[model samples]
Target: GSSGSSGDPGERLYDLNMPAYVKFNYMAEREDELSLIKGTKVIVMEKCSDGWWRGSYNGQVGWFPSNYVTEEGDSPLGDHVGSGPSSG
Candidate 1:
């Protein structure tokens, strides 16, 4: 069942090209906040496939755009990728 929002999460999360953040919100400091949470051994899931992603840091699974993910020795963040602060 859906947790927060109404209906389903991924059912409506099928949008192409989304952003992946260690924190749920951009500009939010999640390191200290999420430190207590347990994480999985597998950090990366389906390098280029977007759908469901299980974060290695907290095991708090969520969805991120596939384009934001990259393979080993490379980065998915290409041109147009910004590393500065994020908007709400």
Candidate 2:
């Protein structure tokens, strides 16, 4: 997804940590991908319309999918979350 207007630093528009209910556990399947296991944390940069999320982990940056790295109450409803005002 495209970059959007950033909100205040501590006022994140959405939760960034992976949900506890997910069962995903694995290293990144490809280059330029994220490997988010349990207890992993990231700064969610965007949730794309194509079904992947861009974020920064530790010091690496890349895109990862949901199911393994999702918000606390997020569910796939075919609707975009945080699809707010464009940054540019």
Candidate 3:
């Protein structure tokens, strides 16, 4: 309700890409003043050249390593691609 100017958060976020969110798989150790807890959901605002991602947790912006987090609906078996179980 308090989006202020534009109602679009994606266009407003970081001005990099769309406003995306990630689920933290591990406790992210913040490199800056901002930090978030393990399993906490965060909004991805931008990416860094250092391989870290800029994210916002409850309005607090911070930087975290990508490996420590994951996109929702991701799977550990993402490396596999098949036509599902075939009925012989």
Candidate 4:
């Protein structure tokens, strides 16, 4: 018999290796901060609890405010990992 049941969505997907789009322009005031341009995309390396995130762009890696950029591909679905057999 096949059992079909609805389950709770309790898993949190903390995808660190995700790309983000810059919402506005940002100038780095410190050496550890990253300068960003509007409409640019950067890879979010790490997400900090203090509303800041580490990202890499144009061969530069540094920290930036989380609100300055919009996260992309955060959905659990849509992203294809591989083109193989569909098996759990």
Candidate 5:
């Protein structure tokens, strides 16, 4: 559910550029919205006075609600074989 494809190469700032950040864009429902656009990166830095998580992405940093994201980054968390704390 992407608002529109970031089709223009000029619009893309990074490709495979994994920053040292954990960013996210959340949706109540998957639909074409601004946040749903692929390549729209987000980074959770800290929480603001209002309890919103301050984030940085797309070259702009701001506060976002925490419930919309996970503590992980924009990449796959890796292929763990469930050997952390549980047995499958």
Candidate 6:
């Protein structure tokens, strides 16, 4: 038999399964935390309400601060302005 019961509304859903780029370098404080480097890509697995996120990079999985990363398309330097020789 199945009973209908509404779950708690305090549990908010977040956007996971997205790729994020590290904006700042973060050294892992704990063994379960992931060390992040600037401009590195991280695969976001889970996002917590307390601003902690679980992700994987370079086959390493661990937790890191959510504020230290940004969306893939939102990288600080996504394009190269002066890669080739320019006449100034």
Give each model's whole-structure lDDT: 0.34, 0.59, 0.58, 0.80, 0.44, 0.81
lDDT by residue (1-88, candidate 2, tens digit) is: 8766775454323344433322364378777787766665566665665567766677766667765764545455877665544586
Instruction: For candidate 3, write residues 1-88 as lDDT tens digits.
Output: 5658875544422534223434444454545634656656666667766567777777777777766666543334857644533587
- lDDT tens digits, residue span 1-88, model 6: 8775755555654435568999998999888999999988998878888889888989988999989998784333867544433486
- Tell me which of candidates 5 and 6 scores higher on lDDT: 6
Whole-model alpha-carbon lDDT for candidate 4:
0.80
Give every collision pair in model 2: none
Please give the TM-score that candidate 1 achieves against the real structure: 0.23
Q: Across residues 9-61, which tens digit of lDDT does each residue of candidate 4 receive?
A: 44333446678999988899998999988999998878876678889999898
How do the predictions measure up, each by TM-score? 0.23, 0.48, 0.46, 0.66, 0.35, 0.68
Task: Provide the lDDT at 80 for model 2.
Answer: 67
Model 1 alpha-carbon miss at residue 61, Å: 0.6
Q: How close is candidate 2 to the true structure, as a TM-score?
A: 0.48
- Residue 85's C-alpha lDDT in candidate 3? 38
Please state the error at residue 65 of candidate 2 in Å: 0.8
lDDT, candidate 1, 1-88, per-residue tens: 6467565443432223322333232121444222212121224432323433433334543433322333222245657645533698
- lDDT winner among the candidates? 6
All candidates: CA RMSD (Å)? 14.0, 11.1, 12.7, 8.1, 15.7, 11.9
lDDT of 4 at 33: 96
Query: Candidate 1 vs candidate 5: which has greater lDDT?
Result: 5
The candidate, 1 or 3, that scores higher on TM-score is 3
Q: Model 4 TM-score?
A: 0.66
The candidate 4 region of ten consecutive residues with least summed lDDT is 6-15
Segments of candidate 6 deviating more than 4 angstroms: 1-6, 12-15, 73-88
